Design a protein around this nucleic acid. Structure first.
Length: 94
RNA sequence: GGACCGAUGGUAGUGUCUUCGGAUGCGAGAGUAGGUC
């Protein structure tokens, strides 16, 4: 199983964007709920290998937010503009 | 070749504090997911 171990976050307003990049982690979201989504901090070099196969977007992944296991499927992964990296990824509530 | 509208999160952008060096915020538009008819 893929399983993209994250942790829940709400510091998105830039505080997250500077701690995540400060440790080579990288933000995501878990949307298409009905009440609201869920932003989660995860490893870039992990999720890199993960959306790097079609099974990741075509099949569900398990976001283990600090040990809590959330089913979601990738719906908009954003690549870097020239580098072989990512800008952001989302998943939708599987 | 359903139509219309379109969040959160993202990155673009933008401050604030400040002995000006340093530190630290908030974050589009468009698309997506969804809503409405």
């Amino acid at each position: 199983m893929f399983t993209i171990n994250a942790e829940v976050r709400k510091e998105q307003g830039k505080g997250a964007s500077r701690r995540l990049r400060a440790a080579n982690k990288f933000p995501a979201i878990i949307y298409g709920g009905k009440e609201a989504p869920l932003a989660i901090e995860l490893d870039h070099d992990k999720v890199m290998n993960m959306q790097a196969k079609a099974e990741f977007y075509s099949e569900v992944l398990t976001i283990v937010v600090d040990g809590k296991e959330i089913k979601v499927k990738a719906q908009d992964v954003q690549r870097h503009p020239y580098k072989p990296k990512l800008q952001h990824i989302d998943f939708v509530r599987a």
